[PDB]
Design a protein around this ligand. Structure first.
Ligand SMILES: COc1cccc(CN)c1
Ligand SMILES: [Ca+2]
Length: 223
């Protein structure tokens, strides 16, 4: 997260860290046994880490649970990043509490202008590399489809939305991938892509979660 703020320990209880020996992506806990992330975060050997603040120190609220299976969206295209969504099942159910909690799926799609919360442990510089160890947060509005398409000609599908600031300075970044965009207590987006981070006229692009609720529910119900 570039240009954000320190969230505060366990203030984003649905935020998870995906760890394969090291943090590589975020995700969102959507019930006691399932996480939603980006398809471009797919890899084998994933441990889901819940209740994290400092991802480098055991602070006492963590639950470390290995993934039993991953399910990438059947229509995911890694070139265009269309359908950039993946489900991850935990080997055992997380113990839910105030600091480890699921985030509800959307009943409706959020409109342009809606204020959302984007979070993650990604790079905090738009040119440097500095990785924070504590969770970072950014409040950002969803941008209009027209402005999003104008920012990225030929690349924005109906399964994507832009959020952030055309002026730059505030954005998600590398390592935030797969993490949540939450608006009014619902998961509306997944950190997906962009051109660099926090650059003028290149806002973050996010997977449009409301298009996938049926797939998510059916997949969970049979797996
Ligand atoms: C180019 O690396 C990125 C990874 C995730 C999200 C974003 C959005 N600025 C950029
Ligand atoms: Ca920790």
């Amino acid at each position: 997260i570039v240009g954000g703020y320190t969230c505060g320990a366990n203030t984003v209880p649905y935020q998870v860290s995906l760890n394969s020996g090291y943090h590589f992506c975020g995700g969102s806990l959507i019930n006691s046994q399932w996480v939603v992330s980006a398809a471009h975060c797919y890899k084998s050997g994933i441990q889901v880490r819940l209740g994290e603040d400092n991802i480098n120190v055991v602070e006492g609220n963590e639950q470390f649970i290995s993934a039993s299976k991953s399910i990438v969206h059947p229509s995911y295209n890694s070139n265009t990043l269309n359908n950039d969504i993946m489900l991850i099942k935990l080997k055992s159910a997380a113990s839910l509490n105030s600091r480890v909690a699921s985030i509800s799926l959307p009943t409706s799609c959020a409109s342009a202008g809606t204020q959302c919360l984007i979070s993650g442990w990604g790079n905090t510089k738009s040119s440097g590399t500095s990785y924070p160890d504590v969770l970072k947060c950014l409040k950002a509005p969803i941008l209009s489809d027209s402005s999003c398409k104008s920012a990225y000609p030929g690349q924005i599908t109906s399964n994507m939305f832009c959020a952030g600031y055309l002026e730059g300075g505030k954005d998600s970044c590398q390592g935030d991938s797969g993490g949540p965009v939450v608006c009014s207590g619902k998961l509306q987006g997944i950190v997906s892509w962009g051109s660099g981070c926090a650059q003028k006229n290149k806002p973050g692009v996010y997977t449009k979660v409301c298009n996938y609720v049926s797939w998510i529910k059916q997949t969970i119900a049979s797996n």
